[PDB]
Paper text:
Ribonucleotide reductases (RNRs) are highly important enzymes for all life, as they are solely responsible for the first committed step in the synthesis of the deoxyribonucleoside triphosphate (dNTP) building blocks of DNA. Class III RNRs, strictly anaerobic, generate on a separate activating enzyme NrdG the same type of 5’-dAdo radical through homolytic cleavage of a C-S bond in S-adenosylmethionine, with the participation of a [4Fe-4S] cluster. Here we present the crystal structure of a second class III RNR from [name] (tmNrdD), which, as purified and crystallized, surprisingly does not display such a cysteine, possessing an isoleucine (Ile) in its place. Nevertheless tmNrdD binds a substrate and its allosteric effector in productive conformations as expected from previous structures of RNRs of all three classes, and it is enzymatically active.
The native structure was solved from crystals obtained under three different conditions, one with the buffer molecule citrate bound in the active site, another with MES and a third with glycerol. S1 Fig Occupancy of the active site of tmNrdD by various buffer components. As in T4NrdD, the α-β barrel is decorated by an extra Zn-ribbon domain inserted between the last strand of the barrel and the C-terminal loop containing the glycyl radical site. The identity of the metal ion has been confirmed by anomalous diffraction at the Zn and Fe K edges. The Zn2+ ion is coordinated by the motif CxxxHx6CxxC [CxxCx14CxxC in the T4 and E. coli enzymes]. The tmNrdD structure contains a C-terminal loop harbouring the glycyl radical site (Gly621), which dips into the α-β barrel such that its tip meets that of the finger loop in the active site. Since the T4 enzyme structure was solved as an oxygen-insensitive Gly->Ala mutant, the present structure allows the native conformation of the radical Gly in an [name] to be observed in its resting state prior to activation, as also seen by Wei et al.. Gly621 itself is completely buried from solvent and presumably undergoes a significant conformational change in order for its hydrogen atom to be abstracted by the 5’-dAdo radical generated by the activase, as postulated previously for T4NrdD and PFL.
Residue numbers in the entry:
A (entry chain B): 1 to 56, 63 to 330, 350 to 560, 565 to 640
B (entry chain A): 1 to 47, 63 to 331, 350 to 639
Write the structure that this text describes.
Amino acid sequence: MKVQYSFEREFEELMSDLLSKYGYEMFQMDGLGDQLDVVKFTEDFVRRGIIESTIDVTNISTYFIEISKPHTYLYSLYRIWQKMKEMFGKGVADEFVEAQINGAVYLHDRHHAALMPYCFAYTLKPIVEKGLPFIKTIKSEPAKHLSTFIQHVIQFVMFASNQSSGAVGLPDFFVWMWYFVKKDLKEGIIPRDKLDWYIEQHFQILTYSLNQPIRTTQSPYTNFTYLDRNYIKAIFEGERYPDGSLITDHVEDIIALQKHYWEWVSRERERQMFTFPVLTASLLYKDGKFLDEDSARFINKINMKWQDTNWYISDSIDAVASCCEKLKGRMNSIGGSDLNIGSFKVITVNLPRIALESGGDREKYLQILRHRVQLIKKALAAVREIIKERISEGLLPLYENGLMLLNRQYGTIGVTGVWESASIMGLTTEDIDGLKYTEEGEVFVDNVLDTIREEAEKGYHEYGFTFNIEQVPAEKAAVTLAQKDRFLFGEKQPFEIYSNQWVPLMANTDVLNRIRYSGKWDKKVSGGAILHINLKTEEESFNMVKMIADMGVMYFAFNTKISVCEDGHAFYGERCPVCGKAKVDEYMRIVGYLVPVSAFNKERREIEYPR
Amino acid sequence: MKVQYSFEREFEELMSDLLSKYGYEMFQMDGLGDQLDVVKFTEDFVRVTNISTYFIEISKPHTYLYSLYRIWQKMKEMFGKGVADEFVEAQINGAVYLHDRHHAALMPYCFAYTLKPIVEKGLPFIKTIKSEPAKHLSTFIQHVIQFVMFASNQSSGAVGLPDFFVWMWYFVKKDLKEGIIPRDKLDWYIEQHFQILTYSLNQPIRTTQSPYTNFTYLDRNYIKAIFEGERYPDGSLITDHVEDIIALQKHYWEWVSRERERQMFTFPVLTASLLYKDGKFLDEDSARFINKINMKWQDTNWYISDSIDAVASCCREKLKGRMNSIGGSDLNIGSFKVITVNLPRIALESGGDREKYLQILRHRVQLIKKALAAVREIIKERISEGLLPLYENGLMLLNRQYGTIGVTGVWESASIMGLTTEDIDGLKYTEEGEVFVDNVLDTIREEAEKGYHEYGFTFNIEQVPAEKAAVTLAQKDRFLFGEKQPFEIYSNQWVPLMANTDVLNRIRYSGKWDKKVSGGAILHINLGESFKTEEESFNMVKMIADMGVMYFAFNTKISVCEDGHAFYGERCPVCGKAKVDEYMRIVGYLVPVSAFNKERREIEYP
Ligand SMILES: [Zn+2]
Ligand SMILES: [Zn+2]
């Protein structure tokens, strides 16, 4: 049966031509093949469970999310083409569509691309002050008590996760939670002899709610930040609680509450392992010292158990000063995005493609790169115009209620496969300290990133909004791009998956090289990357941390292999110390946050070896 | 651009034939026209609602199309191609109405749950984390909210919680014992949790509509009968705490009546279930209580029953127990799917010939039973595929779910047949009309009862609320029969809500016919004037119960201001601002009329 979708003739001509040029397998690999066939999709979907049971469970709620993704992707691609045609001409639009489809670029959350924005790290201030104004079918009063505050936070997170594609960050959670803890303590709502119990009960309610998905089999991606004293002071200078008291008058209370959570979390994993919220600590570090060494030592000590917190290092708080037109502030897809910073969309450049296209010619490579990045900037501009259209149509209330801020969102140019690009270029080698870039290779990466940065900087004056760069997690992109490239270039592309760190996670190389590379290149993407290392004592750990910080790494973590039994208890080894049963899975940091390897491998294998 | 959906050739041929027979406008009216064009749909939608609604609405035509196809396949497997084809034609042309059709081959309709499994096991249907059973009130409430939200995405209709207060009391008492509640703030603490729960159930996180939930005030008899032998987690006997549970239920009803002044809201829909026999309430205290509290907003529905036999020892093979789409469904009773017969269509097909009407009716209900059987088989397949964990974890029980034969437009049907009139006490059925309605209902009853031995499961009947069906079936019939179908909308009450007729006629008809559909109906009466005293209200209630009416309510017109306060008149006593809308019970639960009529005129005049 033939169902008609109504497109402009030129777009249909474009899609037909692209089909003739590239073949159905490209469209299939892009997600615009048999996936569009509702019957095939459904029939395949309803029997995934048997296969899962045979090889290794999803429920019906996943069906209703997934069925339409190909269709809303097709729509999004079309609308982006339209807007780009409007803004820059048909040539550019056609070029973009071709690049997206053939895999020269990777449009992130493409099924959402013309409908809602990517991500944001929120301040809860408007939640505390206004309640839930974005829910228009009932007027909700602002929270007066801790329980109602926790409720509102949970509800906000769930609401926001359906108005955006990516992370819901809450860097100032504990700032606002403290207020209600103290308020309820004062009014005798909380019996004093039950204070810590009351706090931990609310930690538990929130944390578990953020790991208990109602729809689909995955919770929304959330982040918590341990704000050091420097950050609390800089961010909340001048700000007051709803009782009129100064927030900066309560730095110690906030630090103490944050500390309580990090301790409670470390304890709780032995009862039940969980992913969210992803934990980052934001520390100001200058001239060989932490400016809040108490907090740094705390994070250092507490991390010894699970290494479940990511280290954010900065040398300045200028970018966040008095925060509560050129945009500054860190944007990172994994964690550590500064308060009131986000990205409305990421479009990634496939660097290995350029390697294959260039045939080892670095000058040609850089020309191609520049052009590609300019194209991406144009697409990001179109997307932004589309989001503004959606805001105007009353479809995105988070913008209307001052929670998501469009002028505080970057347009992001992503990169993936730096290593693989260099390798195809012939600019990598193995010496005594393991796998590494050749000198010429380091220079090449320098050039790639400096070029991208140059263009990103030009973008502000070109388009009116700020661009950033990120080495994206690319859980799916890293497979699909490599697949498209293999389909196009064959044996010349020998990699099954492209990398998302400057040197591959599982590379046989010296830690010092990794650290050095991140030290060189993290600043070029303004901290839009992560160094996480698979692996002494507390002071040895601290010395390592200081060392890594001195070397200029902006965001990093150490990885352990966290065993879990069938009952969910976290431990190390093959034997569970709580229940006595055997390890059956592990949690690890694979792209920057802690996940079960089994879920990761299910996902990877099912997008890498389909049908 | 053309996008191929891969159907069996016989189905493609069928659908092409039906398109040739009925026209693109019939398909348009059915939701299988331009709605399938993603681009058109998207650009239409995009010009209250937010983006989360888009992602729900976009796929509905497509998953309806799939569900129709899959049901066709199953019916063909079970009954042959002919029967399958017949059902598809009947669904597309409006002779029948498959409810929640976008979900119909994917997940079941509704259930009234016990929270016992939640109290004892936690959230076992959420399998990516292991959740300990709640030890305390805050976590119990959390778990209840989470369960409601999870369940609302595994089913199409109501999530009933008739025994909520039975289980909430345990945790109240427990936290009070262990020093978590400071005595002096006991009622504040209870009410905080009433607030968190209630508001959560009226604050949509996705769409502009909350899940449909129900609460039931269980009288002492139902509490005793349902929970005989059952224990709380401390080993104490539930029936040892009847008075504490009653007090907690009373506390909630009093709290909600008071809260509406601060902010109006719809959910949970409130029902009071009372045992009434030989002219008296067996728990008169509860009766007088509900009667008293209803005086302000009339926000509670009266469920009246003459026996607790159906619910006896329910905690602890023809299915018995009340099923109702609005409220009052008995604990651990549900329906996996409703398919409604368009009675007006039969009237129009019959030409006024009642025997022909009855032959057609019987045939069509038989077809409906076949379709229900096929849907049930599909649900079983979904359970086997691991897709519906509420069945796996014993919250939803397939052998406690009816297949439902719905009816709508009884009145309009009788009207077209020439069987209604008007005299001094208003619009009404003639004698022949009443006999006719008896015959219709009795035919459906006969077939429902045959169903059990025919298909291995139990069938029920409901006069469905038909919020959209009542419009669309009338539109399809209008399209097919023109001036012969004079009604804009079919009725969901034995005599239409806005018909000018004596109240005694309504009560009498409900008295005659509620029993024939085993309580699968509602009588709700727009109030001329408010009741002048409690005793009067109570006399009216008792009189309604004496006549055999099984589920009923009185409607007030509740004003709201722009800030959401509930009151009466034109000016807000709270903030002084002007009335901007009204809450009323239109199909049986309290909603804003603005949204209802928006929704209605939308489907009436696209
Ligand atoms: Zn264990
Ligand atoms: Zn008011």
